[PDB]
Write a protein that binds this DNA or RNA. Sequence first.
RNA 1: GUGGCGUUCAGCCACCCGAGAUUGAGCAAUAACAGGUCUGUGAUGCCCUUAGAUGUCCGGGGCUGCACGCGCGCUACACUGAC
Length: 129
Amino acid sequence: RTFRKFTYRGVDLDQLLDMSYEQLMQLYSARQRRRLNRGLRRKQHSLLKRLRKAKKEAPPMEKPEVVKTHLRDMIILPEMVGSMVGVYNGKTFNQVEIKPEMIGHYLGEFSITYKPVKHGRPGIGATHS
RNA sequence: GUGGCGUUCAGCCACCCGAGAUUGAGCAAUAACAGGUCUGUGAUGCCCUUAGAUGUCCGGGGCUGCACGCGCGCUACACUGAC
């Protein structure tokens, strides 16, 4: 909290916003670079359009409206930061804050698909001889 | 084939010559099991369902989740070794 620098790969968020796709390919790691170099299809662009619209329609100095999606394989782009995304579990839409320091990840790893297990008592034949 | 045993039958043992003196499979009876499979089938009876479908397609998830118990395995514990 002492310093306010983001510095993703040595570059902070402003020139990391205005920089195009073809050099933040070089900025990312191998899997995200291959996803970006390969085609980024229609529904991903529709999600980005909805995120931009909900961002610019937000009144100043509060959070934008939550945007739901099934696309839990979207790369979290720098364009997406500070947004309000509901990511599907199969069952529910989970509220996720797109923080600046999650820009190399998928949306799927912020909405957990299962309930973590706490064990009951081993039932009957659970312990053999 | 030769020798020996055998009721001198059916055969067995040893040996010579030989590539070889018993290569490995496949197929495979009568009678059966409430064995498994309706999730192989445009094999199938009966029951259920049939539009807010248990038909079908699309999106996402699960089948892989982890205090524990069991089974088939893989890699090892090195100097008959590793590099």
